[PDB]
Ligand binder design. Structure first.
Ligand code: CA
Ligand code: CA
Ligand code: CA
Ligand code: CA
Ligand code: CA
Length: 310
């Protein structure tokens, strides 16, 4: 059923060109705030733990998270597909992690800021209620900074949740990074393509860029890109079965959320801040120098660099 069980981006983030399966993530929840998920997909069914809808007339709506788009299923599979109970499917970065499929986007792929905010806060409340470490993964954004979403992100961060979000797809001009990625308490993820330039992976032209003034210090301010990850031509799970290949910072984001879950599961005593520091150090050690604006060191195209397993 799967044309590639270990897609290029999974091999790249593992830093293993002969990888045969992925592993890790046990006990960590990845809350994928998106268009829903195909929770019966063979490669996801073993990890679906929560399924809630934030787009309806009351909120949350439990036991409802149907993907009619594909985007949310695809993102989930990159983060945590587990090969299926027959080992014949695709693998995501953290195949042992738990999926919280939170539908915050309508079937069109667009969503309302109040719904997104509500889901962020709910994921935090569920982390607190259950006593479990949780990563919010948001493959979504806007050029405008919405205060409902920003306040929700701060709330979640205060409760120990890690927030990972797409940089956006409005590149490559300076200052195109969107929100929530551009918030100080969210990890903004830039998209790599499977092309080398200047001896490194290349940032895709579409990936939104941060700002010159605050890039270079290896400290995240508002508007800074943080981590780069594979985003172009990513094979993953799709909503009505099967698989599909699509591109974007939406695809890069779950590579980072999945990596974060893998790392966190190896030491769940890390605070969200300490986990973020681990990721930042991984990234710094793999400096990205390809693509418009990319440079030696921390830069506004690729942030700190490309965080990898080893
Ligand atoms: Ca769990
Ligand atoms: Ca609504
Ligand atoms: Ca940020
Ligand atoms: Ca900075
Ligand atoms: Ca760089």
């Amino acid at each position: 059923r799967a044309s590639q069980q270990i897609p290029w981006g999974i091999k790249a983030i593992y830093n293993n060109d002969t990888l045969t399966s992925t592993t890790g993530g046990s006990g960590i929840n990845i809350a994928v705030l998106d268009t829903g998920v195909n929770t019966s997909h063979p490669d996801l069914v073993n990890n679906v733990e929560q399924c809630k809808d934030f787009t309806g007339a009351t909120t949350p709506i439990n036991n409802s998270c149907t993907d009619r788009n594909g985007h949310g299923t695809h993102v989930a599979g990159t983060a945590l597909a587990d090969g299926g109970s027959d080992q014949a499917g695709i693998y995501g970065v953290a195949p042992d992690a738990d999926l919280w499929a939170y539908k915050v986007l309508l079937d069109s792929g667009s969503g309302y800021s109040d719904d997104i905010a509500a889901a962020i806060r709910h994921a935090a409340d569920q982390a607190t209620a259950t006593g479990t470490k949780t990563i919010i993964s948001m493959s979504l954004g806007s050029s405008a900074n919405n205060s409902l979403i920003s306040s929700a992100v701060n709330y979640a961060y205060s409760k120990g949740v890690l927030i990972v979000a797409a940089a956006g797809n409005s590149g490559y001009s300076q200052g195109t990074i969107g929100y929530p990625g551009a918030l100080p308490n969210a990890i903004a993820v830039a998209a790599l393509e499977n092309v080398q330039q200047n001896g490194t992976y290349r940032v895709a032209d579409y990936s939104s860029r941060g700002y010159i003034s605050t890039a270079g210090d290896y400290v995240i301010q508002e508007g800074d890109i943080e981590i780069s990850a594979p985003g172009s031509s990513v094979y993953s799970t799709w909503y009505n079965g099967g698989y599909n290949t699509i591109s974007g910072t939406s695809m890069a984001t779950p590579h980072v959320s999945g990596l974060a879950a893998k790392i966190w599961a190896e030491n769940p005593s890390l605070s969200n801040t300490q986990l973020r520091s681990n990721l930042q150090e991984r990234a710094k050690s793999v400096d990205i120098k390809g693509g418009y604006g990319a440079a030696i060191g921390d830069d506004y195209a690729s942030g700190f660099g490309f965080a990898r397993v080893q």
